[PDB]
Nucleic acid binder design. Sequence first.
RNA 1: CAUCCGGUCGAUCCUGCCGGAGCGCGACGCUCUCCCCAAGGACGAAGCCAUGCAUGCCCGCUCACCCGGGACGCGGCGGACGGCUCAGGACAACGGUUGCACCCCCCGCGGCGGUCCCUGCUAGCCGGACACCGCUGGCAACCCGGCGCCAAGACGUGCGCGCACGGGCGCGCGCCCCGCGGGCGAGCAGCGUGACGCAGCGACGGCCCGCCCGGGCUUCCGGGGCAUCACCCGGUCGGCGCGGUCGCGGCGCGCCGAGGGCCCGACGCCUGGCGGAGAAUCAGGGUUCGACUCCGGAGAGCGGGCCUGCGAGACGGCCCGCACAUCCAAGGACGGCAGCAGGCGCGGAACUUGCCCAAUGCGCGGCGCGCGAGGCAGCGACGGGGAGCGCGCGAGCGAGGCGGGCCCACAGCCCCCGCCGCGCAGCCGAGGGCAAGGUCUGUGCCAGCAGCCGCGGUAAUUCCAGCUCGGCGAGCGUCGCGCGGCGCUGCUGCAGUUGAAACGCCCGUAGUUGGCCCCCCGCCGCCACGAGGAAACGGGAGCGCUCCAGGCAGGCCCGUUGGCCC
Lengths: 257, 176, 168, 77, 140, 133
Amino acid sequence: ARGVRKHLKRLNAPKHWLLDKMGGIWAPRPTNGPHGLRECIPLILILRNRLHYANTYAETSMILQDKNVLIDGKPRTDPTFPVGFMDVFEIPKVHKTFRVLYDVKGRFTLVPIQSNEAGFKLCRVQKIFLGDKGMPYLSTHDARTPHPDIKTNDTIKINLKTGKIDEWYKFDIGKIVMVTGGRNCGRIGTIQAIDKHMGSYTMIRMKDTEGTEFLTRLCNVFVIGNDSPAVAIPTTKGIRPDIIKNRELRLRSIAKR
Amino acid sequence: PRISRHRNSSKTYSTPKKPFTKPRLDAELKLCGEYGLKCKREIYRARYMLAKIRRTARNLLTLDENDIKRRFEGAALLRRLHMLGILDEEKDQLDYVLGLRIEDIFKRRLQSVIVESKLAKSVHHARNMIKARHISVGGQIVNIPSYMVRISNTSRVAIADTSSLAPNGKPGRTKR
Amino acid sequence: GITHDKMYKRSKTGAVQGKWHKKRKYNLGRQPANTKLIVKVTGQKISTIRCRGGNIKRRALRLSHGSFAWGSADISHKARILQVVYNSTSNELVRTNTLVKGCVVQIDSAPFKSALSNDTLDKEILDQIRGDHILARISSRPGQVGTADGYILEGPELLFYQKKLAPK
Amino acid sequence: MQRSIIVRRDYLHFVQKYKRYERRHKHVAAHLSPCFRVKEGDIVTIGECRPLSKTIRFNVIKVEPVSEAAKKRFSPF
Amino acid sequence: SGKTSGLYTARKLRTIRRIQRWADKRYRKAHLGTWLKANPLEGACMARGIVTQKIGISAKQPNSAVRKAVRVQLTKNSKKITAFVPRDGSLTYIDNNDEVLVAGFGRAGRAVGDIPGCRFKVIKVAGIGLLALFLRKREK
Amino acid sequence: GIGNKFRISCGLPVGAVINCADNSGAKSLNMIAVKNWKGHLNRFPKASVGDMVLITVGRDGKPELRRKVTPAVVVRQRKVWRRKDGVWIYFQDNAGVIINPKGELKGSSITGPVAKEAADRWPKISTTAECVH
RNA sequence: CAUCCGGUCGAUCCUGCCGGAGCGCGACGCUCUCCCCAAGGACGAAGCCAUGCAUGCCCGCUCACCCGGGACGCGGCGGACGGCUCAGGACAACGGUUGCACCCCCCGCGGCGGUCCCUGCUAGCCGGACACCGCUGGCAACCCGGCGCCAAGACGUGCGCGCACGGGCGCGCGCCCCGCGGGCGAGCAGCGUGACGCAGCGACGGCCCGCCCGGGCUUCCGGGGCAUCACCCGGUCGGCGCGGUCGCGGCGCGCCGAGGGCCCGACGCCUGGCGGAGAAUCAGGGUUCGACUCCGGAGAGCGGGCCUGCGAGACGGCCCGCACAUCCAAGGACGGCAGCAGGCGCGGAACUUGCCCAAUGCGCGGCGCGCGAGGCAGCGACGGGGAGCGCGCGAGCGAGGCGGGCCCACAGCCCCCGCCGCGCAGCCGAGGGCAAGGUCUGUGCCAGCAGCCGCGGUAAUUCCAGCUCGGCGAGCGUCGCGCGGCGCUGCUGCAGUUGAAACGCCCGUAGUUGGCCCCCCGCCGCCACGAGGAAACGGGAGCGCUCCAGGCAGGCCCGUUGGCCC
């Protein structure tokens, strides 16, 4: 069909961005880069709509036209540059630091973190490639590209300062793990089991802290600390609040309103 | 293209399958006379919503008591009716919802709540007064006679702060 | 307008297929560049053709010479390249002297004559090395890669092939 | 065909307007190695392959014979 | 009759319905496509036309009257329609070969009432609806 | 026609069916007669290149043109003719182009080579013809 | 979300269909007091088009200019995205599900980064070679000529480390098989070893790698009618050797065989055939429709054929064949509104040659413009929703008008203010079905009415009028169609003695259906439970748009929400 599309309609946009159906024919489109289109959120919305800092979409481009915002410790200014999972985003004018995390419903959330938390970044290890003239290399969930005793699915704690391997979270049963994709995004649990089937789509079984054994695909699994979260968890601890527990919260919110 | 197409609309008024039934027709004239309704379309909107709410209770009936969906929907459906003041506050059961009649929807009318407050002492005068916006629901002047006041706002509904009774300025014949 | 699109082919049931589209650029095909053996060299013009994604391919159309390897002794050297002997698909292509992988060719023995001094290095290549021409087949796609390297025929392919062309 | 067999794939299709299943048959072309000796009425375990020919995208990975001809019986294996 | 009811008889049930669904005259008229090709008003609510002649039709007995009608040639299919001009004395409003819009009598291609052979009836003449002319809401 | 013509050997007599150069949708034109022909007794009317001929479109031709005597112009002839410059010229096939009584051509395009004599006589033929030989 | 009534007779009970009764969505007639919301030349013409507009943005060089204000050309990026419309296309498209160990992919993001030379070097870093612009000129126009001169982060050349290096090579694991990796479910990689090529990029380091965003294909299942279509196909079906392509493949070619399909409907034909997300109607099951919003396809009068590019077999590129045109000085030139307005043809049927990029995006580069994308207004009874035409004894507006406030790219409209204050209805009927005159006029089987049964033949409950009354309501009538009705299509759930209908009879192949019986597993089917795969949409939580149809808002806040299901 001719060439690559460079537009994303509002109805086409993923549900997680939560862009209002009316008021806009089309949502912004991410750029090819560290994260994927449905695996990332736009930087313009994070400031313009989520934080409400920019009154118009254009006046979000103005804010980063002059350097003022950083992703993963790098200026990374482009307005629609993809900002995805475990990203160290910091507004130095606001003097605030936010990991981009997944909410229990599944939408992305900016959660404030300590400078020590800003010091390290979490990214999953994709399959090791053997290219670049035989030098072993492995890619991340953020596409960044080694230590020999490492496998795929494990999470490396890249510093973003050293830009090198630090604490490697090996993929084994019982590590406290996050779910990146599927219906139960944001939920945190130790991996009870794995059934490979020696074909494809290895099954994933996850015992949560409360004893509910949630499940997902093995690709969509993120390690979050070999032992302990080793990150600033948003205050939900992936407890999976139920629809009625969500109605309680909403009704008390209205009471406070 | 044109998000005007994306905006939606719904049929809130249902005509009778049998159009001419003399007993039903006369009863509708009684309702129209007693509750000061403008046309039988007015009644149809109320009849439609009585039906759907009762149907929702019947859908909940085929669910087990305390089913996650049954409890969530059951709480909400009961809550809205007593929140508007339509259903008995204490009962809060599906069986009590099944007995609701359009008279309850008619009682929720702002123009209805005025004849009980003795402000216009006539549904037809209440309708007239609401048109001139001489009745205000708690700091909100209302030109529409079907405000559907929620139970708490019955205390709030009163003559408007704008010139009328205890006048801000000169109202009506005093003005003219 | 050459295409490899399957739309123009009939189905397994021998049924005509409705043409839902005009020929598309991605399914395009290009003229077979028939690499031609120069024969006596007393010219190697190799074309370069733009591909999909701005890639490049080298099209040999006339060439002589090219790298060859004696697998049995594992010695590899450039060779002059003599006439094509056998095409396995056509008897006309051999006489035309078009070059395509799988076409068996004669080669000069002068670069590889250095092994005549050595002894017991097989017997078949020993007699070809003594002779002016060595039996060898092409191992490179002359048209797509733009080079026509080959392996000197050794053992069974040489046995069957010699019987196929040389005796009368 | 030489170095090729036709695999009949029996299968059921459910109709919802009438809650009954209609029997269907799909023939599939499979390239067979000489290591497989194949007779009609036998049951073969095919596998996916890059298209070998116009109608062949499947290769045989195992062949299971049956005594004589075991009738047919529409077996969705 | 067993109405073929087996777990594997689902092609037979489907086949029987598609073949025997054509027996119904109404389904046949609707989905054969014969009406669409043969309809003077082919998939149209109404059509423009010239009045071939103004000729009354004698009504079917018991009723006895000359119901004034106009033969009409359609612009779209050049087919001749017999259209009954309605109400009282409305034929006078029409002149021979005037523009006329004609709509079906309301029986979906069937004749309505005593008029013999009247699949359609006149709605508008030279841009003016015949009732509008009849009530004098809009004059000729 | 423009100017004074020069006598050239008249290849086509009456009855000569000639192929149609124009795309008007006629394939073969049957020559009924020659415009401007006072003839002697027994002499079939004869026409050369650049001569207007009343023709009738044949059965193969589109029906609208068929059944009407129509004017045409001979544009090519098999018979060799001598130009006053001593060039003896001939064409592979005899051909005609259907033209109104005024000079305008019924067909938008003229197919194949066209003779100079026709091109000089008819300005429209000269502009339409790709090659004048 | 489970409902009927009127019509065969002297009456009766049936079958049987006719007609009503409700809804949707288009025409059509008559009328509409506002406010809000809103479809809009798809409907056998993907017919044809006048006019204006729909893709530019920057300087990389600036010698003109003239203070970096900076044109003009070259240079880079984009013009393939976006808008439009369903013509084609019936194992196709399209959808879920797969595979690329058979692959291509600019920007961007995260990394690697030895580039042989004989040499020839200027590598303190080089050439020649042109636009622009002068200077003379053609042409009716279009469009360009020659001269002379000068530029570029343009282009051409060019040192540069033998784990130099793009490519393509020849050779490098194995012992019945099955279990460690840089690996994988799997001999895949990446190299060592011996040659060849001298690819890039290098005159401001990118060679290259991955991720990714799309493609290119591919697996499996779904995927219209017709038997007054029963036999089909012949690169068709396999294998083999080449080419060709980004790549697999009869994808093209030779060669070699004899296949591949089919009553489980092939092939052939037809289609006023885009497909799904969805829509309409509705107890349940069904039925019906998929122009248009979202997605995927396919096309830009019709066929072909192409270069540029990272990507187009591009038509707001080019080239040609075929139509049908326009300019014209007659020599020549130059097309494409299935973009947006607007014209015309046609049809029953469908809007302004309207205004702006400020949002909503996108293009171009850190410093702002381009966009008939989109927004905004105009028309606008497609339709949806909210109020009016009274009420009071004399109470009182909003519909309006006029200035504000405010809104808005600016207007406006709404709303809020002060003043001034003009309430303002129709369209079908009354014999029944089916609601509402055992009133007076005319007329006299005429005129007419009447979906249906019926009325009218000089005392019409049926017409033409008056009068009354009814039903709906700023809407009401009329026609076409879908659905329900209609269990009158019957899976649920129809009938065949006599209302329509058991083949005259029998064998019979496919097809379909097959007594019981073994508990204990293996494959079936089957059933439950997961996992993963866009929303809008339907439902639904929460929420006072003054009420509502709405919208995902809102509020002194779950980490405020926008769950959750489909």
